[PDB]
Structures are given as structure tokens and as C-alpha cells.
Amino acid sequence: FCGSMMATGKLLVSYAPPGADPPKKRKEAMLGTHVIWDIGLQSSCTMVVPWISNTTYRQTIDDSFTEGGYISVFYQTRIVVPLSTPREMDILGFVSACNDFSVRLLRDTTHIEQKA
């Protein structure tokens, strides 16, 4: 939360395992794996997306069969600020792997090339 110290608020970070209608409203998102983040001294909040899958491994490409589900964010209450303070702020987001995480079947990537 990169907003001012005088700025309070409560957000709802959600994770919904595949198979159903991708959450478009707090109501639906609230029903799955989630964390109600309360903004204060502790600048940041971490939500763990648990290894929940049918197959022992997922494919490093877009694939209906090995789909991971939906990660969505919402306003639990609402960002509140006093006078003489900026009514708009930015929140930065970071992703990393838990100690139970692994990869296999080494392969050449598409993120770089040499046309010519």
C-alpha cells in the first residue's frame, strides 16, 4: 500500500479454484480462498494461493485441462482519507513461489528470439 499514512482502508484479496463462474462481485469472491487485508503500520499484506489441482503438475501454457482458477481483489469497506490529503493512491503487487514449488521438463522459451 503506497498511499499516505493518514489513509485507512480494508481490502479483500481472493483466490477461486477453477470449474465455476469467474468472480465478478465481492459476494462470489468471498465464497472461496481469501484474505481480508487491513491497512495500517504493516505496509504490506500476503495472500497464499495454495497448491489446489487435479493433476500432479500444470502446463506452462494456457490449457483448459490444467487451469489454475481466479485471483481477484476488492474493497471490503472503502479507502478513507481526511482533508488536505490525496483521495487517490497506488498499490503495488508482488508474486513469488512457496517452498513446496517446483518445475520440470526443461524447454526453449518464446520470450526471446532471433528472426534472422
Binding site: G19, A20, D21, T55, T56, Y57, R58, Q59, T60, I61, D63, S64, F65, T66, L105, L106, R107, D108, T109, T110, E113, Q114, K115, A116
Partner: protein
């Protein structure tokens, strides 16, 4: 140092025991198939038998022994034309599978699920196409394995052939057929010869066409593809080559048995086609 070396696949089957006459309340011959079971009977139960020391074995009929043979799963066609030709140098792209051909597929299909280290052997044969007379220097083939997600080659000579990460086999014509081994690479605890379902769930609230998918089809791209080409530069005289891929299942395990495919295969699924549904031939009830 040296390490030397319960019922073994190659152990002699049970000996036939001497059996005499019978006048008892015991009824082995009589039963009830309705229960779902098969009568464990043996010659000595319904007739007078002599003592026989059995030497015969089921060694050759074991799961490994039954499949312990290199089977042709596909024939890839590539070529190397004259620089001048207007048409592109032909390089092959094959989607890896055991269903393009029937023999091995029918055998694997005697079972629902399977598990095994895969041994791929490559037999390469080349030949001249034009009533020409010019010749060509010994060809060197490049068999590149492109796993699902990796940049699939668009030209016999584009950047992808660098194979920095992907596994490539550089085969030299006239030399002993190429060979490599591959572990049990399934994203599941066992290969599925059959999938009674779909890769997608059609959601009401969402447009029909979107939730649609093929019946019995899981990962749109199970195991990636085999991209083959002739490394040698365009040669004045055109030479066409063919790559025959032999697949052998080793260190294999199988589950849940099934009745063998009785009628002509029709696509990658269990689908049958009109005009092929009458396998059995005419033979009278009371005729030997």
C-alpha cells in the same frame, strides 16, 4: 562390487494331480455365474486324471514380455530441394502419439491406464526423386523435440533449431538407427488410454461456444511435437527422405483390463464408422 541374484513370471505352472472316481455331496461342476465370479475348476474336478509334472511357463505372456517389442507409430517425410525451386525446403512436424497407427494402439488399449519408460528408435531412409543424374553428399538429419509451450519451427532453418534448451538428435545417414530413452513424463500418476469426460465445463451464465470442447480429449497438447529437418544446405539434385519412428514401452505397468478393439479404428477416440460394424463371419450353430 558384484551383486548376485514371490511367484516369478517364468516359474513352471502347477502340476496336474492324480484323481480317482467320485460319489459325493460335493459339487464343483455346479455353480452360478450370476454372482460375477468365474468357476476356479481344473481337469481333476470333473474327470479322472493322472499325475503330471508341469514344465510350462507364462514367461512370454507377462506385461513386459507382451510389449517388449519396437512398434512403428509414424512415418515422417522431409526433403532437400535445389536452391532454385520455387517451393519451400520441406521440414517435418509430427504431434507425438500412439494413435496414428493401429497395431501398438490396440495392444495398449487392452487396458484403461498405463505407466512406462519410453524407448524411441529412429530408422532413416533416403532416395532420389528426379530422373536426373546429379548426386548428393551424405545427409545429416536434426530430430528436435518441441515440448508444449516452446517456439515451434516455421522454416527448415529459423532460430528455433538452435535447441539451446530442447532435446535434439543429430543423426548421420547410413549409420546405425538413432535411439533415445524417455521417462514416465505424464502430468498424471499414470497414462490415460481413456478419458470419459472433457477439458472444459460449459457454464450457463456464459456463451455456448466458449464452454465447448472435444469429448474424451484432455490436454489439447499432451506431449508436444517432433520437428525433423535435413541440416544440409539446398542441393542442385533433389533428395527425399523418410523417418520411421519405432516406439517401445519399457519398465511398464498396466491397470483395469478391457475388451480389445473389435472394429476398425475411426479417429483418436472410441468412435466407430458405418459399414465397419460387422466383424464376425457366418457359421452355423450345429456345424463343427
Amino acid at each position: 562390487g558384484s551383486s548376485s541374484t514371490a511367484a516369478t513370471s517364468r516359474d513352471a505352472l502347477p502340476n496336474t494331480e492324480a484323481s480317482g472316481p467320485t460319489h459325493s455331496k460335493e459339487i464343483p461342476a455346479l455353480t452360478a455365474v450370476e454372482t460375477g465370479a468365474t468357476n476356479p475348476l481344473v481337469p481333476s474336478d470333473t474327470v479322472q486324471t493322472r499325475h503330471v509334472v508341469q514344465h510350462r511357463s507364462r514367461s512370454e505372456s507377462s506385461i513386459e514380455s507382451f510389449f517388449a517389442r519396437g512398434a512403428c507409430v509414424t512415418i515422417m517425410t522431409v526433403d532437400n530441394p535445389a536452391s532454385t525451386t520455387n517451393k519451400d525446403k520441406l521440414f517435418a512436424v509430427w504431434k507425438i502419439t500412439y494413435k496414428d497407427t493401429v497395431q501398438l494402439r490396440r495392444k495398449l488399449e487392452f487396458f484403461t491406464y498405463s505407466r512406462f519408460d519410453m524407448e524411441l528408435t529412429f530408422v532413416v531412409t533416403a532416395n532420389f526423386t528426379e530422373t536426373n543424374n546429379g548426386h548428393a553428399l551424405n545427409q545429416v538429419y536434426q530430430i528436435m523435440y518441441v515440448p508444449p509451450g516452446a517456439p515451434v519451427p516455421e522454416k527448415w532453418d529459423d532460430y528455433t533449431w538452435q535447441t539451446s534448451s530442447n532435446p535434439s538428435i543429430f543423426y548421420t545417414y547410413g549409420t546405425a538407427p538413432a535411439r533415445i530413452s524417455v521417462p514416465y513424463v505424464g502430468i498424471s500418476n499414470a497414462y490415460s488410454h481413456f478419458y470419459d469426460g472433457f477439458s472444459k465445463v460449459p457454464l450457463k451464465d456464459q456463451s455456448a461456444a466458449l464452454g465447448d470442447s472435444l469429448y474424451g480429449a484432455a490436454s489439447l497438447n499432451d506431449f508436444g511435437i517432433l520437428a525433423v529437418r535435413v541440416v544440409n544446405d539446398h542441393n542442385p539434385t533433389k533428395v527425399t527422405s523418410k523417418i520411421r519412428v519405432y516406439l517401445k514401452p519399457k519398465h511398464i505397468r498396466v491397470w483395469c483390463p478391457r475388451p480389445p478393439r473389435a472394429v476398425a479404428y475411426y479417429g483418436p477416440g472410441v468412435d466407430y464408422k458405418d459399414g465397419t460394424l460387422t466383424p464376425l463371419s457366418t457359421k452355423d450353430l450345429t456345424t463343427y
